[PDB]
């Protein structure tokens, strides 16, 4: 799995590959790893598919009940709910989740929740098995307040390299853009990103 | 005469505590009305702010239960909010368990079943409220379902609740006797709200300012309440013809 | 076991082989692996056979009660949500690997679900020991906008690949077609390409071949009157 | 909090009467008339859809309910009590039978389970009895067609034909004169409609009358084909049009 | 150590023309030691017959459990349980112990009293139903029984021909299994008569 | 709080009587009469259904006589729904005993168990007692044919002939007059029907108002048979004994 | 009247009669006085005997090295409440290495007593308490009522005829608050205060009970010949 | 413990049980009676894990004595053996199972027949003409298979039992310190004090 | 009759008399008020000096919940403390799960549902307090008042206790004369005056004034007690207005 979320001038973009493996067998080559827990709060999932789906479904339930009572939740609040589930059940979970969201007050925000259940607010985050191969590239190429087109290129190039070297990553590159304008889904096929 | 204090049968086969809970329903002296359009369901309710020290924005008997379901309550606010919190919890749990949004009629039945339990179990009292649930259901379309302290519920073409419900009901009955259809044949919800307000004015014989009303509107995939300025625009259109 | 699911124009088709095994021994040669959750929601199971049956019937029971409670025809997403939450709770110990397909007022659906409770969406899916043989066929011949006839053909071909190439699969092909606005048609033994040839010899014994010590009538009737 | 009513609310009076059960039966007496008639090849259950308001959509209020594919129920008395009993009856048909034997319960045993639930509300702590009488019609392979009445006490009796609620006394006399052991299902429906007309004041048509039958298997209502042994439900609710057709031959 | 092969034993069931047959060996052992030659593994509740192989304590326990349940069934239903219904009851009862199972291999045999149709069924220790048209096998010599039945069996055998087939299937299977034998019983079941026959076989 | 509404179902009167038990017995005195008569070669159970209708489906109806197992049956007087709760519990106890000891439950052990359950509701729990009196007819290989009765107090006693329900005073006097120890089942059948015919509050005793059962060793050889009489069989025995 | 059957029932004027009846038990109890300066806090208690053969019922209970109380009313209820205080003082020391503030001790007693006034089945406590202590903010005196009301005071008295002692302390307020660094004079003021509540009987050697806590003084109780000095 | 044997003859059941109690290195006792009288005509011998054997046996004894008092009636040997089997079958799926194997020798006064039941710690019950637990059967069953007759007298049963014990004393590595022998018949239970 | 002997029983009117009797206990209590200002809220309460022996400034009545909410109440003081303890648990669990401090409307409903729950059963007694509370959250200032029935609304100004009628009239003047709004420092002064004016209903004994406030500019949105010079300035302003 190669996943990442990157804040930029107009908000935040989440990115992911589409490969799900059982050992060396690709059980699903068109997986959607970008998950909606609220209208403009999404997450990228890595680790146990069963665990991250179970967690995400519970978070979506919590934020739906939050919204009915207290109105739209912040991205920080969503990250906190994720963290509560991951930290308190750390012994029984294998989940690495990146939470990304857009407020109008706070704009684009990214939180990463690694295996232990700690929370880290970052300008951008990378995770999954494929992320190891792009720490150098992403650190060298990330800038704050990029444009939408620049951020799409940064994620496309980053995940391209992660896919190239990591056998557990592959398929299509999916992206979800979170801004004031709304929610936009993007997809990029092998013939596009392999020639980069 | 302790058959009047708890929910057990009187010699006539009556439940007096249920009957008295129906009487508590009119304690707020507020009338509500609900009607269905082609694409929408509209609910209006009288808004009375008798104290100048009150923040009028917090005085409400309309609730946003889920994204799709709205609920207006006739009765005291403590029992209203009790029912509101439960309905919100039930709607959220339903979505989590069964993977789709709780329908308006199903929520009404669920809250009606809970109410039924209070009429049979002695330690629980009935809630002194009548709950009108509204939505545009993905299967049934525009929907009005109303629940009472007896645990009764039923779907409505249109409905009215409050001290002067009979006047509003007869007014609505007479209109649907003319039109011979089960809804307001109108494209926009704005005009369905205008219909609702007009027929409440006719039935009650009173005029309304923007602060005298409270309006909820259900459309496909969302329920929302109108602001005082949205209602003002509605009142202006009514007066201009 | 080989099970597949294939989406088409106006619905979805699922298929399965009919061999069940303990180890290297074939327990049943004509096993029914297509299970009904509700009239128009069917699923096929691989893994522990009792678990696939039990989890189907439990969710199928609760789906029926839910349908009566809500006065609505059951949805595939409801079956999926109830199945996954049940399976996740038991942390993979209930060894049910299912392909869940069906039609409802929302449309036609195809999902897979693993024993740990992870789920998948797709236009074509395969599960079981013969899933790699089946997926090879699906990946070679699947296209968008398949007709009903093309989807049945593709599904049964994918099962055949499992039958012939996977030792865990064999015998017959079962198919169930779920089309929007129609009754689901269950096609038991849709293909029968493995009928045993006539034996060289009859092994019917002469009467009195077996040595007998005692004979007696067994009273299966209740205590009698008079 | 906690339910601190752990004592019986129904108790024996000096005369030996169980007051709360008697009063529950009084509530049933006030209820709208419902009836059941058993024929040789089916059972019919019927009642009036007493609409509380003309603005109400009475099709959304089901007085006649499917319990299993071959068992249906109707009531007289308190509607909400009936609705929750239907929910419990549907569930108990699964939990205490179908999940054990892989088949739906026979009519008499489902009736027995419903009766047990109603008996317990008559003895358990901090509850009142259910204010309904039920008429349950059904079919099963080994018992054939049957019709049962269940009262607030939990007592149940099998009937050839009967009525409960408002005008039951007059209706039962009407049924006694008309019933024989050679009736076909259509004859029973005809008698049901005749009997029900006497207790109905206002409109009498397919929109104000609710009627269902337990009869032949309906393969068209099964939802799937391919299993020869599965032939469809025997319970079928008659449409508004189907009722009106038989009201011309009345 | 393996609970399903401590005591040993086998059951086999077959269908014929308007009849069914169910048969079992009589051995109970403690691994290598032969303990009893009178341990019958076939029971009946009304007209429904149940064979049970595996761990002997569970064989006895389940017989008592199904006697218990079919007796209550009869009192409430006012009729004897049928093979199809009983098969579901066995499955339900086994699966309720999903994570602490009875170590058994049950086999149901009987004729439906209303339809007259012959019925047989097999189960794994956890309740999965094998409803074969031809034959069901169970026990420590199930491989041997599969080999015998697959070659010896032919459909629509008359009761007295079916007896010879099932007897020879059991006997020769048991003689290739160390933990089966020490006597054998065969039930021939018709709609309203059942005959029970004890077979003569080698006692080693 | 809740104390206000508590009837206190398990208290003594100043005279040392249990109010609810006494009032439950009053209830039972209005139920249809049930009679049990024990003979040397079997037991007879006869009972009157309460004012019936012509539309009642009698052949599938059961309100008085119930089977507990193959050897033991009961006649009921009181609330039928209450009785069925206890009857199911008794059926389970019998099967629990059979599973434990691999022998049919002795009649008295079953009777004591049900009677102890009734007793519990009079001493603890604050619930109303079961408004039911049973006549137990049964056979075991220790005491042979046995008749017992139990009432809402949980007290039980053994009998040669006994009645419960309505007009027990008149019924018991009639039984005491004509009962003899060397009596046979066919004689007991006649006594039971004659007693009901005289004590009934109905105008005449007919087949549709009766439930009838016999427990006989009239089962072929060393075993016992229960016979719940069919409506036609009750009609025949009424003609045979010369009541209709 | 119709509203005094239990603690869960308000009267039509908004009164809780069971709580008021519990308050009445304190008025029947023997007099006890509390007063403090800026360095020390003192409890003085008139102990009551059953007869001439009997002992004099103890009135003062130590809760910690820095805190303790005197009681008036049902003595077993004081034992329950003082035990609870002992535990809370102890919890504070063990978990936080911190001596429990006297004001916080009052808050805990209030909340414990309150739960018995709003629930069915229970009853209010039938005892009044005077809590003295020396913590990080100096000397303190609290008065506890079983209604839940806890009040911080310079001086007070509860029990029968306590009004006489309370008026005296109200007069002497400006004098006894200034008795700093002189334990004996502060006790004298307390013994003189409790004397304004005596009738027919006087303070004897087994009648009088005195407690003191202060800056460099652990909570200690004086009985017997230890109080003869003050008689 | 170690060797327990049982033989049902014409009119009685004979139970033989070893006397040794060994705790690892040392033989602590050589006169231990590994049996309990459950009722006047029912005897149970036992062997298995230390502590559990006596605890189980006395628990069963207490239950059968309780039944006898409540009903004023002695349960048949079959009924007692069924009760014991259920307790062990219940026990085997407990948190800590009873590791106890038993023989139940009883004389049925109703049928006028001796009866011997063998039940292991799993709840495996069999009615036998002769039985054993542990390795005892490996040495003795070939002798019993040869000489046993269903019409044997009590004296002949004791003589066949002596031959079995002699073969055990010859070929078994462990010194079990002889056996206590008890006879169960119509007159009750008695111990053979010279064997 | 007998409908007023048990909580949660509906009278033939549809009234819960036990709740109405709880109101009588509230009306018997001392005067407490709340004033919503431009960027916060001000709370004030009358503390009756029963005796000279009461230590001044020690028996604090106003209570903080979390760090941004103030609570004051009239009636049975212990009941108010019980309600605040519950409020503190509600606020803690909200922050634990959602990270952000509990919004004031959210907190209002938590108290509301809890008080309403004590009108559902006869095994509990209704709360004998009306509670005025509020503070600053992400959407600004909020002031609430909660009754024994569980009923609560948002307020511009709020008053309860024995001198509530007097106080309400004073609050209504401020609302009319300041449609643009009142500053936090002005609200503290006005709160002092209103308590002094409302003390006429309790004129027998003298009293002690206690004021607190949460303001975005003056206290950084945190609840703080008005102490020392600022308190004395408010007391002087109040004493000047009554003369
Ligand atoms: Cl990381
Ligand atoms: Cl519900
Ligand atoms: Mg790759
Ligand atoms: Mg109630
Ligand atoms: Mg896991
Ligand atoms: Mg062999
Ligand atoms: Mg051998």
From Swiss-Prot, chain B:
Q: Where in the cell is it found?
A: Cytoplasm; Nucleus
Q: Name one GO biological process term.
A: proteasome-mediated ubiquitin-dependent protein catabolic process
Q: Which Gene3D superfamilies match?
A: Glutamine Phosphoribosylpyrophosphate, subunit 1, domain 1 (3.60.20.10)
List Phosphoserine occurrences by residue: 227
- Where on this protein does the Glycyl lysine isopeptide (Lys-Gly) (interchain with G-Cter in ubiquitin) crosslink form? 222
A GO cellular component annotation here is: proteasome core complex, alpha-subunit complex
The UniProt entry, under InterPro entries, shows: Ntn_hydrolases_N, Proteasome_alpha, Proteasome_alpha-type, Proteasome_asu_N, Proteasome_sua/b, Proteasome_subunit_alpha6
Keyword Ubl conjugation applies: yes
Give the quaternary structure.
The 26S proteasome consists of a 20S proteasome core and two 19S regulatory subunits. The 20S proteasome core is composed of 28 subunits that are arranged in four stacked rings, resulting in a barrel-shaped structure. The two end rings are each formed by seven alpha subunits, and the two central rings are each formed by seven beta subunits. The catalytic chamber with the active sites is on the inside of the barrel. Interacts with CIC1.
The protein's job, in short, is: The proteasome degrades poly-ubiquitinated proteins in the cytoplasm and in the nucleus. It is essential for the regulated turnover of proteins and for the removal of misfolded proteins. The proteasome is a multicatalytic proteinase complex that is characterized by its ability to cleave peptides with Arg, Phe, Tyr, Leu, and Glu adjacent to the leaving group at neutral or slightly basic pH. It has an ATP-dependent proteolytic activity.
Instruction: Identify this protein by name.
Output: Proteasome subunit alpha type-1
Swiss-Prot record, chain F:
The record places the cross-link (Glycyl lysine isopeptide (Lys-Gly) (interchain with G-Cter in ubiquitin)) at 99, 198, 230
Q: Which SUPFAM superfamilies match?
A: N-terminal nucleophile aminohydrolases (Ntn hydrolases)
Its cellular-component GO annotations read: cytosol; nucleus; proteasome complex; proteasome core complex, alpha-subunit complex; proteasome storage granule
Main subcellular location of this protein, as a coarse class: cytoplasm
Localization of this protein? Cytoplasm; Nucleus
Asked if the Swiss-Prot or TrEMBL record annotates the protein with the keyword DNA-binding, the reply is: no
The protein's UniProt keywords, in alphabetical order, are: Cytoplasm, Isopeptide bond, Nucleus, Proteasome, Ubl conjugation
Statement: the UniProt record of this protein carries the keyword Ubl conjugation: yes
Listed GO biological process terms: proteasomal ubiquitin-independent protein catabolic process; proteasome core complex assembly; proteasome-mediated ubiquitin-dependent protein catabolic process
Q: Which family does it belong to?
A: Belongs to the peptidase T1A family.
| Miscellaneous comment in the UniProt entry for this protein | Present with 17100 molecules/cell in log phase SD medium.
Q: What is the stated purpose of this protein?
A: The proteasome degrades poly-ubiquitinated proteins in the cytoplasm and in the nucleus. It is essential for the regulated turnover of proteins and for the removal of misfolded proteins. The proteasome is a multicatalytic proteinase complex that is characterized by its ability to cleave peptides with Arg, Phe, Tyr, Leu, and Glu adjacent to the leaving group at neutral or slightly basic pH. It has an ATP-dependent proteolytic activity.
The name under which this protein is listed is Proteasome subunit alpha type-3
Q: What is the lineage of its organism?
A: Eukaryota, Fungi, Dikarya, Ascomycota, Saccharomycotina
Gene label: PRE9
From Swiss-Prot, chain H:
Keywords noted in UniProt: Acetylation, Cytoplasm, Nucleus, Phosphoprotein, Proteasome
GO cellular component terms?
A: cytosol; endoplasmic reticulum membrane; nucleus; proteasome complex; proteasome core complex, beta-subunit complex
* Gene3D superfamilies (alphabetical): Glutamine Phosphoribosylpyrophosphate, subunit 1, domain 1
- Kindly list the GO molecular function terms attached to this UniProt entry: endopeptidase activator activity
Against PROSITE patterns, the record matches this protein to: PROTEASOME_BETA_1, PROTEASOME_BETA_2
As for family, the record states: Belongs to the peptidase T1B family.
Q: What else is known?
A: Present with 21800 molecules/cell in log phase SD medium.
What is the protein name for this chain?
A: Proteasome subunit beta type-4
Species of the source: Saccharomyces cerevisiae (strain ATCC 204508 / S288c) (Baker's yeast)
Name the gene for this chain: PRE1
Curated annotation (Swiss-Prot), chain I:
Compartments where found? Cytoplasm; Nucleus
Transmembrane segments annotated in the record for this chain = none
Q: How is it modified after translation?
A: The alpha and beta forms are probably products of the same gene with different post-translational modifications.
Gene Ontology molecular function: mRNA binding
Does the entry feature the keyword Acetylation, yes or no? yes
Highest taxon of the source? Eukaryota
Does the record's keyword annotation contain Secreted?
no
Which keywords describe this protein according to UniProt?
A: Acetylation, Cytoplasm, Nucleus, Proteasome
GO annotation, cellular component aspect:
nucleus; proteasome complex; proteasome core complex, alpha-subunit complex; proteasome storage granule
One GO biological-process annotation of the entry reads: proteasome-mediated ubiquitin-dependent protein catabolic process
What does the subunit comment say? The 26S proteasome consists of a 20S proteasome core and two 19S regulatory subunits. The 20S proteasome core is composed of 28 subunits that are arranged in four stacked rings, resulting in a barrel-shaped structure. The two end rings are each formed by seven alpha subunits, and the two central rings are each formed by seven beta subunits. The catalytic chamber with the active sites is on the inside of the barrel.
Give the similarity note. Belongs to the peptidase T1A family.
Extra remark beyond the main annotation: Present with 12000 molecules/cell in log phase SD medium.
Q: What name is this protein filed under?
A: Probable proteasome subunit alpha type-7
Q: Which organism is it from?
A: Saccharomyces cerevisiae (strain ATCC 204508 / S288c) (Baker's yeast)
Gene that encodes the chain: PRE10
